[PDB]
Amino acid sequence: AMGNKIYVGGLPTCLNQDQVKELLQSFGELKGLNLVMDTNTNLNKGFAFFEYCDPSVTDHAIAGLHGMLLGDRRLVVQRSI
Template sequence: MNIYVGNLAYGVTEEELREAFSSFGEVTSANLIIDRNTGQSKGFAFVEMSNNSEADAAIKGLNDTALKGRNIKVNQAKPREERPARRPRY
């Protein structure tokens, strides 16, 4: 299951995310979203867990809990919507 994690402190690392979620089960991947221009975290991430019941437990257990001083928002990620192609800037 793909899990959305929002309201992250900018200092949170992928390893810290992996550690927080691994207490609920096996974490397949943790992907912190980074701004291309600044190289800084955008304040959200996606965590993939292979077992759905473990993922549900992680969502219930971690939603609205503090991680590095901020209460994180954790829920099942929605499928990515198709977006129109970007037009080049001139």
């Protein structure tokens, strides 16, 4: 039982996953980030899926990360579907 994948539905198309990953890593060590991108435009779909190195960070991360990002743009963070 090692599956604590997180969903962020607040990806700005103005930035790349490298930017968001760094924001996600603010809560803990990132183990993997899947930015769902539109291969036609090379832009983000507006959401991504990630997971920390530690499974316990997940619950702690969502708690603060849900609604955290500079400006009007924000991250909708929750357990991934």
